[PDB]
Design a protein around this nucleic acid. Structure first.
Lengths: 151, 127, 99, 100, 79, 114
RNA sequence: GGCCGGGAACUCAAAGGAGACUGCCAGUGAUAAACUGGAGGAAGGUGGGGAUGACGUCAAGUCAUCAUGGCCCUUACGACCAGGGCUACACACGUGCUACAAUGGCGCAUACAAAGAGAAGCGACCUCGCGAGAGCAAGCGGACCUCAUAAAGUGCGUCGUAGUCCGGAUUGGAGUCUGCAACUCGACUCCAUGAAGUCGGAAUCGCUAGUAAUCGUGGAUCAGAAUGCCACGGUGAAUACGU
């Protein structure tokens, strides 16, 4: 806005574990006001993912995210009649938001049988450094690097 | 002796009586697990007793009516907080700083003429 | 036996005046009365268009309210019934008496 | 409205009041089960000789002050325009502008 | 329409049909009654039905029974 | 498996599979299977010759396939020949149950013609 | 089983009252007006939502709600009556409803609302019909009777990516009800048939918190005929670095 200051909304932690990050993830996954379905899908995915790697769900989730967090990005500027890409730094909250959004978008486009299965597959592949999420990170970083002259 | 509290949320009202000893909760003549099938609702109802270390020292008799699931859970939490304050009168600081002593005054907005909902307008075309 | 009175009005000051009058007369003639109990109010709504031609927004919303009261007399006597039936009240209060 | 339309309305109401009971009897005959099965045919043939305007469903509500056939309210006997005029002048007991 | 009522017909039409059948030969019969079901005792006759401007002559056959009279005199002109 | 002159799937349940006949819906499928005495979630692959003969006998009681098609064609032809309102609509290709024709009507008119 | 005797404590109903004022604390500022923080409190700085529309602009809309200056017709541009039309159909545009599916379809069985209407009216229990409905009949001018069973949800099975157990246009046969009367031209039920469509070019709209999105419920006009209009609650987000 122009002359406004906006505070931060409180978010309740998850019931099974106690993390607000997982609550934000469930929120980003939900559609049409159906929170119970999203909670089911997330919990099933984390359960099926813990076995594959022999570590706690929180640790697996953190490992998956650390390979998709971005650092720099490009904005568009046009004051002289031409569009330039300008590289800017990202802050931690936006890092987390973008990581989760990309993960979910990549999962939705897969071709397995159930949403839980697709999510588990995507999380495992991300931990192994493969998939569309990591591809998106790399593309954004390439675009940021190609325009260092405009900083 | 009994300690009493009234609680409210969206469209729900809850009457909470608390007595001392051997923690057990009855709600509308059923158990907590029978009544609520949602982990979030259970956690909400259980919060204040977890916050103040008295989980296994008080029996709770509750009645509630109006609304849905989340509204009723919130009403119950509010009522428990009021009853505990009546019982002790020194946990007020902790309960307030946690955030259970405030009433949540969020209601449903009305429909208005010329709109499809409270804030949604029809589609607009220039030509 | 027992007597029941129901009163209706569009104006609550008028209804309270009438109720106080009835209670006073009843009590003064040596008969117990159970204080007036308020009952739910009725709200009726209307919506109209305010232009003689096309314009479809631009409406007006109106309301009418009806107030209701109920009074109980537990042990009527002949003099009490006579006193009640020989009373007159305002012209905007509707009174119904049941035995 | 025109002067002839209200005349039509008055005529309709009069006839519909005149012929009420006969129609009720004939319709009871036709509706009731275990009838002669020939009285039914005769009654059906007879119910169509009574004048058409005698059926209550040929009537149309109109405002009592002007005659408008659209925008009618039943509690007041008038159309929206005249309802608003009376309401602002103060001639409808209990009515006032509402908000909530 | 309901089966517990029987088919509908106009009294004047029914009387005209009775008279024509008993008296034998009949030139076409003029009618404005398009809401009358066709009865079996009508076959062999000519009914001229209104359609808005003129009267269309219909010569009754045995496959028409159960139909209304109006279905054989359309009301609109299209080309 | 052949039933009424056609082959019905073999990996489906009986209630779904039987509906491949032109004249058998879900209700008639349930009725036939109840009359024959077979379950409803049994695959057509695990039946026997006796069961299949029973099902053929059950299906024989209805009108199906060519006879049904002949009936429909004769019905429509009767009207088209008589020349009533419905018949004219049938033989011009415009809707018959009194719908709108200022717009829409595209299942009876086909795709647009500029 | 609030059933019964009871109680006036609690939910709740509807009349009188109290409360929020930059009133108190620290800092900045012209020894100002104000601004950024904190205490208590249900609520804090316009607490949230309504009604309330300045002098004027567009010879803007309405002589078909009503009233009125001037013009025009009076065996007719005024009366009455049955049939038809306003529902047409090579085509072009605006506003909506249902979908193109596994965050799903189908079968069983089990929680939790709010606000309304009713005498030429709302119609319980019982019996008959696969069903829309039919017969006989209590109660209610109503915090009492009736309309009236909320749905999404939760638990257990089946379907396994197919133009399908996704979608439900069109058409054939047989019926129910209102009404003198359902051809043109009504709503609803049963059996059958099972079209287009696999997320939509250039353009382009709504929304800042109990909001968007999604699920059900009621009323006015009304013999009968809402996917429109006006109202009610349940579940419940994402983002605002800046000009």
């Amino acid at each position: 806005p122009r002359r406004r200051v906006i505070g931060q909304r409180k978010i309740l932690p998850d019931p099974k574990f106690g993390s607000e990050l997982l609550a934000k993830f469930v929120n980003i996954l939900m559609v049409d006001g159906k929170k119970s379905t999203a909670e089911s899908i997330v919990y099933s995915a984390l359960e099926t993912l813990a076995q594959r790697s022999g570590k706690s769900e929180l640790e697996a989730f953190e490992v998956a995210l650390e390979n998709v967090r971005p650092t720099v990005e490009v904005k568009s500027r046009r004051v002289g009649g031409s569009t330039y890409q300008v590289p800017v730094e990202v802050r931690p909250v936006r890092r987390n938001a973008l990581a989760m959004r990309w993960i979910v978008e990549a999962a939705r486009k897969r071709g397995d049988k159930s949403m839980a299965l697709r999510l588990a597959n995507e999380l495992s592949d991300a931990a192994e450094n493969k998939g569309t999420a990591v591809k998106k990170r790399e593309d954004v970083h390439r675009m940021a690097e190609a325009n260092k002259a405009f900083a | 002796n009994q300690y009493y509290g009234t609680g409210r949320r969206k469209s729900s009202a809850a009457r909470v009586f608390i007595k001392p000893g051997n923690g057990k909760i009855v709600i509308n003549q059923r158990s907590l697990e029978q009544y609520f099938g949602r982990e979030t609702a259970r956690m909400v109802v259980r919060q204040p007793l977890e916050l103040v270390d008295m989980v296994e020292k008080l029996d709770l008799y509750i009645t509630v009516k109006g609304g849905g699931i989340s509204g009723q859970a919130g009403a119950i939490r509010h009522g428990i907080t009021r009853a505990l304050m009546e019982y002790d009168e020194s946990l007020r600081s902790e309960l307030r700083k946690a955030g259970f002593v405030t009433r949540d005054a969020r209601q449903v907005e009305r429909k208005k003429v010329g709109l499809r909902k409270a804030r949604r307008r029809p589609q607009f075309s220039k030509r | 036996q027992r007597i029941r009175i129901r009163l209706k009005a569009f104006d609550h000051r008028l209804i309270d005046q009438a109720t106080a009058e009835i209670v006073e007369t009843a009590k003064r003639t040596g008969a117990q009365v159970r204080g007036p109990i308020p009952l739910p109010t009725r709200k009726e709504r209307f919506t109209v268009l305010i232009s003689p031609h096309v314009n479809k927004d631009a409406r007006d919303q109106y309301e009418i309210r009806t107030h209701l009261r109920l009074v109980d007399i537990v042990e009527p006597t002949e003099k009490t019934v006579d006193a009640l039936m020989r009373l007159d009240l305002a012209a905007g209060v509707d009174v119904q008496i049941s035995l | 409205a025109k002067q002839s339309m209200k005349a039509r309305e008055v005529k309709r109401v009069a006839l519909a009041d005149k012929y009420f009971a006969k129609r009720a009897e004939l319709k009871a005959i036709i509706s009731d089960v275990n009838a002669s099965d020939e009285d039914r045919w005769n009654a059906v043939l007879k119910l169509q000789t009574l004048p058409r305007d005698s059926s209550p469903s040929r009537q149309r509500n109109r405002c009592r002050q002007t005659g408008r056939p659209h925008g009618f309210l039943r509690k007041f006997g008038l159309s929206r325009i005249k309802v608003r005029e009376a309401a602002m002048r103060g001639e409808i007991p209990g009515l006032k502008k509402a908000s909530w | 329409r309901s089966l517990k009522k029987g088919p509908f017909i106009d009294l004047h039409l029914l009387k005209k049909v009775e008279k024509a059948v008993e008296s034998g030969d009949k030139k076409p019969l003029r009618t404005w009654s398009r809401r009358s079901t066709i009865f079996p005792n009508m076959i062999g006759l000519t009914i001229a039905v209104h359609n808005g401007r003129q009267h269309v002559p219909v010569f009754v056959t045995d496959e028409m029974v159960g139909h209304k009279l109006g279905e054989f005199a359309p009301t609109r002109t299209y080309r | 498996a052949r039933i009424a002159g056609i082959n019905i799937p073999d990996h489906k349940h009986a209630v779904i599979a039987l509906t491949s006949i032109y004249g058998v819906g879900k209700t008639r499928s349930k009725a036939i299977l109840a009359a024959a005495g077979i379950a409803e979630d049994v695959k057509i692959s695990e039946l026997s010759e006796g069961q299949i003969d029973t099902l053929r006998d059950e299906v024989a009681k209805f009108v199906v396939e060519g006879d049904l098609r002949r009936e429909i064609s004769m019905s429509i032809k009767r009207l088209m020949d008589l020349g009533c309102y419905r018949g004219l609509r049938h033989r011009r290709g415009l809707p018959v149950r009194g719908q709108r024709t200022k717009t829409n009507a595209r299942t009876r008119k086909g795709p647009r013609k500029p």
